[PDB]
PDB file of all heavy atoms in Angstrom:
ATOM      1  N   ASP A 399      56.313  55.291 -12.083  1.00  0.00           N
ATOM      2  CA  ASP A 399      56.795  56.092 -10.969  1.00  0.00           C
ATOM      3  C   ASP A 399      57.449  55.186  -9.937  1.00  0.00           C
ATOM      4  O   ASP A 399      57.116  54.004  -9.824  1.00  0.00           O
ATOM      5  CB  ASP A 399      55.658  56.890 -10.316  1.00  0.00           C
ATOM      6  N   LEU A 400      58.391  55.756  -9.188  1.00  0.00           N
ATOM      7  CA  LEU A 400      59.115  55.045  -8.146  1.00  0.00           C
ATOM      8  C   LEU A 400      59.153  55.902  -6.889  1.00  0.00           C
ATOM      9  O   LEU A 400      59.471  57.093  -6.950  1.00  0.00           O
ATOM     10  CB  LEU A 400      60.540  54.715  -8.595  1.00  0.00           C
ATOM     11  CG  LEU A 400      61.131  53.394  -8.106  1.00  0.00           C
ATOM     12  CD1 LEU A 400      62.527  53.228  -8.669  1.00  0.00           C
ATOM     13  CD2 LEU A 400      61.142  53.316  -6.591  1.00  0.00           C
ATOM     14  N   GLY A 401      58.830  55.290  -5.753  1.00  0.00           N
ATOM     15  CA  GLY A 401      58.833  55.982  -4.488  1.00  0.00           C
ATOM     16  C   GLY A 401      60.198  55.932  -3.821  1.00  0.00           C
ATOM     17  O   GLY A 401      60.797  54.859  -3.704  1.00  0.00           O
ATOM     18  N   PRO A 402      60.732  57.085  -3.364  1.00  0.00           N
ATOM     19  CA  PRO A 402      62.030  57.049  -2.676  1.00  0.00           C
ATOM     20  C   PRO A 402      61.909  56.526  -1.253  1.00  0.00           C
ATOM     21  O   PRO A 402      60.825  56.110  -0.831  1.00  0.00           O
ATOM     22  CB  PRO A 402      62.482  58.514  -2.707  1.00  0.00           C
ATOM     23  CG  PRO A 402      61.224  59.285  -2.713  1.00  0.00           C
ATOM     24  CD  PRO A 402      60.233  58.468  -3.493  1.00  0.00           C
ATOM     25  N   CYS A 403      63.011  56.541  -0.504  1.00  0.00           N
ATOM     26  CA  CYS A 403      63.026  56.050   0.874  1.00  0.00           C
ATOM     27  C   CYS A 403      62.378  57.073   1.812  1.00  0.00           C
ATOM     28  O   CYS A 403      63.019  57.670   2.678  1.00  0.00           O
ATOM     29  CB  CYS A 403      64.451  55.736   1.304  1.00  0.00           C
ATOM     30  SG  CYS A 403      65.627  57.076   1.006  1.00  0.00           S
ATOM     31  N   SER A 404      61.075  57.264   1.619  1.00  0.00           N
ATOM     32  CA  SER A 404      60.284  58.220   2.385  1.00  0.00           C
ATOM     33  C   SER A 404      59.144  57.476   3.064  1.00  0.00           C
ATOM     34  O   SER A 404      58.216  57.011   2.393  1.00  0.00           O
ATOM     35  CB  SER A 404      59.740  59.327   1.481  1.00  0.00           C
ATOM     36  OG  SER A 404      58.970  60.256   2.222  1.00  0.00           O
ATOM     37  N   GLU A 405      59.214  57.367   4.387  1.00  0.00           N
ATOM     38  CA  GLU A 405      58.152  56.731   5.154  1.00  0.00           C
ATOM     39  C   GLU A 405      56.971  57.683   5.273  1.00  0.00           C
ATOM     40  O   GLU A 405      57.120  58.814   5.748  1.00  0.00           O
ATOM     41  CB  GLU A 405      58.652  56.334   6.543  1.00  0.00           C
ATOM     42  CG  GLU A 405      59.909  55.476   6.544  1.00  0.00           C
ATOM     43  CD  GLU A 405      60.442  55.231   7.941  1.00  0.00           C
ATOM     44  OE1 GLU A 405      59.834  55.737   8.907  1.00  0.00           O
ATOM     45  OE2 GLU A 405      61.469  54.532   8.072  1.00  0.00           O
ATOM     46  N   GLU A 406      55.800  57.224   4.841  1.00  0.00           N
ATOM     47  CA  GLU A 406      54.581  58.019   4.860  1.00  0.00           C
ATOM     48  C   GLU A 406      53.498  57.274   5.623  1.00  0.00           C
ATOM     49  O   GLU A 406      53.357  56.054   5.487  1.00  0.00           O
ATOM     50  CB  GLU A 406      54.103  58.329   3.439  1.00  0.00           C
ATOM     51  CG  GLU A 406      55.038  59.241   2.665  1.00  0.00           C
ATOM     52  CD  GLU A 406      54.979  60.682   3.137  1.00  0.00           C
ATOM     53  OE1 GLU A 406      54.108  61.005   3.972  1.00  0.00           O
ATOM     54  OE2 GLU A 406      55.808  61.494   2.676  1.00  0.00           O
ATOM     55  N   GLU A 407      52.741  58.018   6.433  1.00  0.00           N
ATOM     56  CA  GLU A 407      51.630  57.474   7.205  1.00  0.00           C
ATOM     57  C   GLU A 407      50.290  58.031   6.737  1.00  0.00           C
ATOM     58  O   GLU A 407      49.299  57.947   7.468  1.00  0.00           O
ATOM     59  CB  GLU A 407      51.825  57.762   8.695  1.00  0.00           C
ATOM     60  CG  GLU A 407      53.186  57.358   9.246  1.00  0.00           C
ATOM     61  CD  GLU A 407      53.504  55.895   9.017  1.00  0.00           C
ATOM     62  OE1 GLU A 407      52.725  55.035   9.480  1.00  0.00           O
ATOM     63  OE2 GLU A 407      54.536  55.602   8.377  1.00  0.00           O
ATOM     64  N   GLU A 408      50.239  58.601   5.530  1.00  0.00           N
ATOM     65  CA  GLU A 408      48.997  59.193   5.047  1.00  0.00           C
ATOM     66  C   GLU A 408      47.908  58.141   4.886  1.00  0.00           C
ATOM     67  O   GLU A 408      46.744  58.391   5.214  1.00  0.00           O
ATOM     68  CB  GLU A 408      49.237  59.917   3.724  1.00  0.00           C
ATOM     69  CG  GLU A 408      50.273  61.027   3.800  1.00  0.00           C
ATOM     70  CD  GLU A 408      50.501  61.700   2.462  1.00  0.00           C
ATOM     71  OE1 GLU A 408      49.854  61.296   1.473  1.00  0.00           O
ATOM     72  OE2 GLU A 408      51.326  62.635   2.398  1.00  0.00           O
ATOM     73  N   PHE A 409      48.264  56.964   4.371  1.00  0.00           N
ATOM     74  CA  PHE A 409      47.273  55.898   4.222  1.00  0.00           C
ATOM     75  C   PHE A 409      46.744  55.443   5.579  1.00  0.00           C
ATOM     76  O   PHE A 409      45.532  55.266   5.751  1.00  0.00           O
ATOM     77  CB  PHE A 409      47.844  54.696   3.452  1.00  0.00           C
ATOM     78  CG  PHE A 409      49.275  54.342   3.793  1.00  0.00           C
ATOM     79  CD1 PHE A 409      49.556  53.470   4.833  1.00  0.00           C
ATOM     80  CD2 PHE A 409      50.334  54.870   3.066  1.00  0.00           C
ATOM     81  CE1 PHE A 409      50.861  53.141   5.148  1.00  0.00           C
ATOM     82  CE2 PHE A 409      51.640  54.544   3.379  1.00  0.00           C
ATOM     83  CZ  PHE A 409      51.903  53.676   4.419  1.00  0.00           C
ATOM     84  N   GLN A 410      47.634  55.253   6.556  1.00  0.00           N
ATOM     85  CA  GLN A 410      47.191  54.831   7.883  1.00  0.00           C
ATOM     86  C   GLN A 410      46.348  55.910   8.552  1.00  0.00           C
ATOM     87  O   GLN A 410      45.342  55.606   9.204  1.00  0.00           O
ATOM     88  CB  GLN A 410      48.394  54.479   8.760  1.00  0.00           C
ATOM     89  CG  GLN A 410      48.510  53.001   9.079  1.00  0.00           C
ATOM     90  CD  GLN A 410      49.868  52.631   9.639  1.00  0.00           C
ATOM     91  OE1 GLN A 410      50.698  52.040   8.949  1.00  0.00           O
ATOM     92  NE2 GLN A 410      50.102  52.978  10.899  1.00  0.00           N
ATOM     93  N   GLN A 411      46.748  57.176   8.409  1.00  0.00           N
ATOM     94  CA  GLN A 411      45.962  58.266   8.974  1.00  0.00           C
ATOM     95  C   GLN A 411      44.584  58.324   8.328  1.00  0.00           C
ATOM     96  O   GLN A 411      43.578  58.554   9.009  1.00  0.00           O
ATOM     97  CB  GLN A 411      46.715  59.590   8.796  1.00  0.00           C
ATOM     98  CG  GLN A 411      45.862  60.863   8.799  1.00  0.00           C
ATOM     99  CD  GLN A 411      45.489  61.321   7.401  1.00  0.00           C
ATOM    100  OE1 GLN A 411      46.357  61.535   6.554  1.00  0.00           O
ATOM    101  NE2 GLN A 411      44.193  61.477   7.155  1.00  0.00           N
ATOM    102  N   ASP A 412      44.520  58.121   7.011  1.00  0.00           N
ATOM    103  CA  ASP A 412      43.235  58.112   6.323  1.00  0.00           C
ATOM    104  C   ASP A 412      42.363  56.962   6.807  1.00  0.00           C
ATOM    105  O   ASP A 412      41.155  57.133   6.998  1.00  0.00           O
ATOM    106  CB  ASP A 412      43.455  58.025   4.814  1.00  0.00           C
ATOM    107  CG  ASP A 412      42.247  58.483   4.020  1.00  0.00           C
ATOM    108  OD1 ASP A 412      41.202  58.780   4.635  1.00  0.00           O
ATOM    109  OD2 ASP A 412      42.344  58.549   2.777  1.00  0.00           O
ATOM    110  N   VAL A 413      42.955  55.785   7.011  1.00  0.00           N
ATOM    111  CA  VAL A 413      42.189  54.649   7.517  1.00  0.00           C
ATOM    112  C   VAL A 413      41.663  54.938   8.918  1.00  0.00           C
ATOM    113  O   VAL A 413      40.517  54.609   9.243  1.00  0.00           O
ATOM    114  CB  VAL A 413      43.042  53.368   7.484  1.00  0.00           C
ATOM    115  CG1 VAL A 413      42.365  52.246   8.258  1.00  0.00           C
ATOM    116  CG2 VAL A 413      43.276  52.933   6.055  1.00  0.00           C
ATOM    117  N   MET A 414      42.494  55.532   9.776  1.00  0.00           N
ATOM    118  CA  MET A 414      42.041  55.856  11.128  1.00  0.00           C
ATOM    119  C   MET A 414      40.910  56.877  11.099  1.00  0.00           C
ATOM    120  O   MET A 414      39.914  56.738  11.820  1.00  0.00           O
ATOM    121  CB  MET A 414      43.207  56.375  11.971  1.00  0.00           C
ATOM    122  CG  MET A 414      43.435  55.587  13.250  1.00  0.00           C
ATOM    123  SD  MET A 414      44.142  53.954  12.957  1.00  0.00           S
ATOM    124  CE  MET A 414      45.814  54.382  12.480  1.00  0.00           C
ATOM    125  N   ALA A 415      41.041  57.908  10.261  1.00  0.00           N
ATOM    126  CA  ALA A 415      39.971  58.890  10.138  1.00  0.00           C
ATOM    127  C   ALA A 415      38.694  58.240   9.628  1.00  0.00           C
ATOM    128  O   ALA A 415      37.593  58.564  10.087  1.00  0.00           O
ATOM    129  CB  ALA A 415      40.402  60.025   9.210  1.00  0.00           C
ATOM    130  N   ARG A 416      38.823  57.317   8.673  1.00  0.00           N
ATOM    131  CA  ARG A 416      37.653  56.636   8.132  1.00  0.00           C
ATOM    132  C   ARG A 416      36.980  55.776   9.192  1.00  0.00           C
ATOM    133  O   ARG A 416      35.749  55.750   9.291  1.00  0.00           O
ATOM    134  CB  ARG A 416      38.075  55.776   6.935  1.00  0.00           C
ATOM    135  CG  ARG A 416      36.996  55.347   5.924  1.00  0.00           C
ATOM    136  CD  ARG A 416      35.775  56.251   5.829  1.00  0.00           C
ATOM    137  NE  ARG A 416      36.156  57.628   5.537  1.00  0.00           N
ATOM    138  CZ  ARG A 416      36.460  58.089   4.331  1.00  0.00           C
ATOM    139  NH1 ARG A 416      36.469  57.299   3.267  1.00  0.00           N
ATOM    140  NH2 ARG A 416      36.777  59.373   4.189  1.00  0.00           N
ATOM    141  N   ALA A 417      37.772  55.059   9.988  1.00  0.00           N
ATOM    142  CA  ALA A 417      37.244  54.257  11.083  1.00  0.00           C
ATOM    143  C   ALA A 417      36.683  55.107  12.213  1.00  0.00           C
ATOM    144  O   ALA A 417      35.932  54.587  13.042  1.00  0.00           O
ATOM    145  CB  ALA A 417      38.336  53.336  11.632  1.00  0.00           C
ATOM    146  N   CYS A 418      37.044  56.389  12.272  1.00  0.00           N
ATOM    147  CA  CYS A 418      36.458  57.295  13.253  1.00  0.00           C
ATOM    148  C   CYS A 418      35.013  57.670  12.934  1.00  0.00           C
ATOM    149  O   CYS A 418      34.370  58.323  13.761  1.00  0.00           O
ATOM    150  CB  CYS A 418      37.306  58.566  13.351  1.00  0.00           C
ATOM    151  SG  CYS A 418      36.954  59.600  14.794  1.00  0.00           S
ATOM    152  N   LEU A 419      34.485  57.271  11.775  1.00  0.00           N
ATOM    153  CA  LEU A 419      33.158  57.699  11.345  1.00  0.00           C
ATOM    154  C   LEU A 419      32.054  56.789  11.883  1.00  0.00           C
ATOM    155  O   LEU A 419      30.953  56.743  11.325  1.00  0.00           O
ATOM    156  CB  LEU A 419      33.104  57.765   9.811  1.00  0.00           C
ATOM    157  CG  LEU A 419      33.357  59.140   9.188  1.00  0.00           C
ATOM    158  CD1 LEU A 419      34.845  59.401   9.044  1.00  0.00           C
ATOM    159  CD2 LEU A 419      32.666  59.242   7.836  1.00  0.00           C
ATOM    160  N   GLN A 420      32.316  56.080  12.983  1.00  0.00           N
ATOM    161  CA  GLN A 420      31.260  55.277  13.590  1.00  0.00           C
ATOM    162  C   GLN A 420      30.177  56.149  14.212  1.00  0.00           C
ATOM    163  O   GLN A 420      29.051  55.678  14.396  1.00  0.00           O
ATOM    164  CB  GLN A 420      31.800  54.316  14.664  1.00  0.00           C
ATOM    165  CG  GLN A 420      33.225  53.747  14.459  1.00  0.00           C
ATOM    166  CD  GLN A 420      33.822  53.029  15.678  1.00  0.00           C
ATOM    167  OE1 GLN A 420      34.687  52.167  15.514  1.00  0.00           O
ATOM    168  NE2 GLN A 420      33.394  53.386  16.889  1.00  0.00           N
ATOM    169  N   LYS A 421      30.491  57.405  14.535  1.00  0.00           N
ATOM    170  CA  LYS A 421      29.486  58.299  15.098  1.00  0.00           C
ATOM    171  C   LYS A 421      28.364  58.575  14.107  1.00  0.00           C
ATOM    172  O   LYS A 421      27.201  58.697  14.508  1.00  0.00           O
ATOM    173  CB  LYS A 421      30.138  59.610  15.536  1.00  0.00           C
ATOM    174  N   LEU A 422      28.689  58.680  12.816  1.00  0.00           N
ATOM    175  CA  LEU A 422      27.664  58.930  11.808  1.00  0.00           C
ATOM    176  C   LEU A 422      26.646  57.802  11.721  1.00  0.00           C
ATOM    177  O   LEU A 422      25.536  58.025  11.226  1.00  0.00           O
ATOM    178  CB  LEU A 422      28.308  59.145  10.437  1.00  0.00           C
ATOM    179  CG  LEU A 422      28.633  60.598  10.083  1.00  0.00           C
ATOM    180  CD1 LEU A 422      29.797  61.109  10.918  1.00  0.00           C
ATOM    181  CD2 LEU A 422      28.928  60.735   8.598  1.00  0.00           C
ATOM    182  N   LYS A 423      26.996  56.598  12.184  1.00  0.00           N
ATOM    183  CA  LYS A 423      26.028  55.507  12.199  1.00  0.00           C
ATOM    184  C   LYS A 423      24.843  55.827  13.100  1.00  0.00           C
ATOM    185  O   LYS A 423      23.747  55.294  12.892  1.00  0.00           O
ATOM    186  CB  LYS A 423      26.701  54.210  12.647  1.00  0.00           C
ATOM    187  CG  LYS A 423      27.791  53.719  11.701  1.00  0.00           C
ATOM    188  CD  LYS A 423      28.694  52.676  12.354  1.00  0.00           C
ATOM    189  CE  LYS A 423      28.064  51.291  12.343  1.00  0.00           C
ATOM    190  NZ  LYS A 423      27.875  50.755  10.965  1.00  0.00           N
ATOM    191  N   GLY A 424      25.040  56.684  14.105  1.00  0.00           N
ATOM    192  CA  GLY A 424      23.919  57.121  14.921  1.00  0.00           C
ATOM    193  C   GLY A 424      22.906  57.916  14.122  1.00  0.00           C
ATOM    194  O   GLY A 424      21.697  57.789  14.334  1.00  0.00           O
ATOM    195  N   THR A 425      23.383  58.744  13.189  1.00  0.00           N
ATOM    196  CA  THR A 425      22.470  59.455  12.299  1.00  0.00           C
ATOM    197  C   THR A 425      21.739  58.490  11.375  1.00  0.00           C
ATOM    198  O   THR A 425      20.582  58.734  11.016  1.00  0.00           O
ATOM    199  CB  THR A 425      23.228  60.501  11.479  1.00  0.00           C
ATOM    200  OG1 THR A 425      24.055  59.849  10.507  1.00  0.00           O
ATOM    201  CG2 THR A 425      24.087  61.386  12.379  1.00  0.00           C
ATOM    202  N   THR A 426      22.392  57.397  10.986  1.00  0.00           N
ATOM    203  CA  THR A 426      21.754  56.326  10.235  1.00  0.00           C
ATOM    204  C   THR A 426      21.075  55.305  11.140  1.00  0.00           C
ATOM    205  O   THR A 426      20.578  54.290  10.643  1.00  0.00           O
ATOM    206  CB  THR A 426      22.781  55.610   9.349  1.00  0.00           C
ATOM    207  OG1 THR A 426      23.578  54.731  10.149  1.00  0.00           O
ATOM    208  CG2 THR A 426      23.683  56.616   8.646  1.00  0.00           C
ATOM    209  N   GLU A 427      21.045  55.550  12.450  1.00  0.00           N
ATOM    210  CA  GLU A 427      20.402  54.677  13.430  1.00  0.00           C
ATOM    211  C   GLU A 427      20.983  53.266  13.427  1.00  0.00           C
ATOM    212  O   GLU A 427      20.288  52.309  13.785  1.00  0.00           O
ATOM    213  CB  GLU A 427      18.881  54.618  13.221  1.00  0.00           C
ATOM    214  CG  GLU A 427      18.236  55.879  12.631  1.00  0.00           C
ATOM    215  CD  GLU A 427      18.558  57.147  13.406  1.00  0.00           C
ATOM    216  OE1 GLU A 427      19.093  57.053  14.530  1.00  0.00           O
ATOM    217  OE2 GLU A 427      18.270  58.246  12.886  1.00  0.00           O
ATOM    218  N   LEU A 428      22.252  53.118  13.038  1.00  0.00           N
ATOM    219  CA  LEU A 428      22.927  51.827  13.044  1.00  0.00           C
ATOM    220  C   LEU A 428      23.915  51.672  14.191  1.00  0.00           C
ATOM    221  O   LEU A 428      24.331  50.544  14.478  1.00  0.00           O
ATOM    222  CB  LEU A 428      23.651  51.609  11.712  1.00  0.00           C
TER     223      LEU A 428
END
Side-chain angles (χ1 to χ4, degrees), chain A residues 400-420 422-427:
Chain A
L400 215 179
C403 51
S404 180
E405 306 174 0
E406 293 287 352
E407 309 304 302
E408 301 179 0
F409 40 88
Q410 249 166 255
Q411 156 265 304
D412 200 355
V413 169
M414 236 72 72
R416 200 26 56 80
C418 194
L419 264 84
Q420 328 168 155
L422 268 71
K423 296 164 81 64
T425 71
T426 77
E427 330 306 348

